[PDB]
Amino acid sequence: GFKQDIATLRGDLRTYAQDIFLAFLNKYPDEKRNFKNYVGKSDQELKSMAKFGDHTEKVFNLMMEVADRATDCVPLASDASTLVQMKQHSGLTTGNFEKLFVALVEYMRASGQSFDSQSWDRFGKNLVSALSSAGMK
Amino acid sequence: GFKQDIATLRGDLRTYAQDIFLAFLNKYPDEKRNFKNYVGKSDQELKSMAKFGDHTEKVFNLMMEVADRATDCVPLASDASTLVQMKQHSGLTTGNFEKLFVALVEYMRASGQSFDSQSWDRFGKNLVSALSSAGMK
Ligand code: HEM
Ligand SMILES: Oc1ccc(Cl)cc1Cl
Ligand SMILES: Oc1ccc(Cl)cc1Cl
- For chain B, the structural domain boundaries read 1-137
How would you label B30-51 residue by residue, b for 16+ Cβ within 10 Å and e otherwise? ebeeeeeebeeeeeeebbeeee
Give chain B's length: 137
- Asked if residues B128 and B98 have their Cβ atoms less than 8 Å apart, the reply is yes
- Asked if residues A95 and A45 have their Cβ atoms less than 8 Å apart, the reply is no
Pocket test for ligand 3, best of B19, B49, B59, B102 (most atoms within 8 A of CB): B59
- Quote the distance between the C-alpha of residue A126 and its chain's center: 13
Measure CB to CB from residue B7 to each of A13, A58, A65 and give the nearest one.
A65
CA dihedral A74, A98, A86, A129 (to 10 degrees): -40
Rounded CA separation B97/A5 (Å): 29
Measure CB to CB from residue A10 to each of B7, B11, B61 and give the nearest one.
B61
Rounded CA separation B128/B67 (Å): 13
What residues of chain B, 2 to 31, have a C-beta less than 8 Å from chain A?
A: 7, 10-14
Amino acid at A89: H
Rounded CA separation A107/A124 (Å): 14
Give the 3-state secondary structure of residue A71.
Answer: strand
- The strand pairing partners of A74, in sequence order, are A71
Contact A61 B11 (CB under 8 A): yes
**φ, ψ at B67 (rounded to 5°):** -65, -40
Rounded CA separation B86/B131 (Å): 12
Reply yes or no on domain B1-137 having CATH 1.10.490.10. yes
The maximal CA–CA distance of chain B, rounded, in angstroms, is: 40
Q: How far apart are the first and last CA of chain A?
A: 31
Cβ of residue B18 lying under 6 Å from some atom of ligand 3: no
Nearest to B63 by CA among B112, B104, B111: B104
Where is B132: in which H helix or E strand?
helix B117-133
Q: Chain B residue closest to A15 (CA)?
A: B54
- Quote the distance between the C-alpha of residue A10 and its chain's center: 13
- Quote the distance between the C-alpha of residue A59 and its chain's center: 7
Could you count the other beta carbons within 10 Å of the beta carbon of residue A5?
Answer: 20
Amino acid at B36: K
Contact B13 A61 (CB under 8 A): yes
Contact A10 B53 (CB under 8 A): no
Q: Is B53 on the interface with A (CB under 8 A)?
A: yes
CA dihedral B98, B101, B103, B109 (to 10 degrees): -140
Could you count the other beta carbons within 10 Å of the beta carbon of residue A48?
Answer: 11
C-alpha triplet A12, B13, B74: angle, nearest 5°: 95
- Please, which residues have CB within 8 angstroms of residue A18's CB and are 6 or more apart in sequence? A47, A52, A53, A56
- Which residues of A are less than 8 Å from B61 in CB distance? 10-11, 13
- Which residues of B are less than 8 Å from A64 in CB distance? 10
Where is A84: in which H helix or E strand?
helix A77-85
Method for structure elucidation? X-ray
Q: Is B69 on the interface with A (CB under 8 A)?
A: no
Cβ of residue B115 lying under 6 Å from some atom of ligand 3: no
How would you label B114-131 residue by residue, b for 16+ Cβ within 10 Å and e otherwise? ebbbebbbbbbebbbebb
- Please, which residues have CB within 8 angstroms of residue A126's CB and are 6 or more apart in sequence? A70, A73, A74, A75
Nearest to B77 by CA among B122, B134, B124, B136: B134
- Please, which residues have CB within 8 angstroms of residue B123's CB and are 6 or more apart in sequence? B2, B67, B70, B73, B75, B101
- Please, which residues have CB within 8 angstroms of residue A64's CB and are 6 or more apart in sequence? A6, A9, A10, A13, B10
Rounded CA separation B66/B76 (Å): 8
- Please, which residues have CB within 8 angstroms of residue A117's CB and are 6 or more apart in sequence? A105, A108, A109
Cβ of residue A70 lying under 6 Å from some atom of ligand 2: no
Rounded CA separation A8/A11 (Å): 5
Rounded CA separation B93/A8 (Å): 28
Q: Chain B residue closest to A11 (CA)?
A: B58
Ligand 2 mean position, distance from CA A58 (Å): 8
Cβ of residue A13 lying under 6 Å from some atom of ligand 2: no
Rounded CA separation A72/A75 (Å): 8
Rounded CA separation B102/A55 (Å): 31
- Asked if residues B137 and B94 have their Cβ atoms less than 8 Å apart, the reply is yes
Rounded CA separation B56/B37 (Å): 13
Residue B58, burial from CB neighbour count under 10 angstroms (0-12, 13-18, 19+): middle
Cβ of residue B55 lying under 6 Å from some atom of ligand 1: yes
HEC string of B8-59? HHHHCHHHHHHHHHHHHHHHCHHHHHHCHHHCCCCHHHHHHCHHHHHHHHHH
Calculate the alpha carbon distances from B67 to A111, B24, B60, B109, B132 in Å: 30, 19, 10, 18, 17
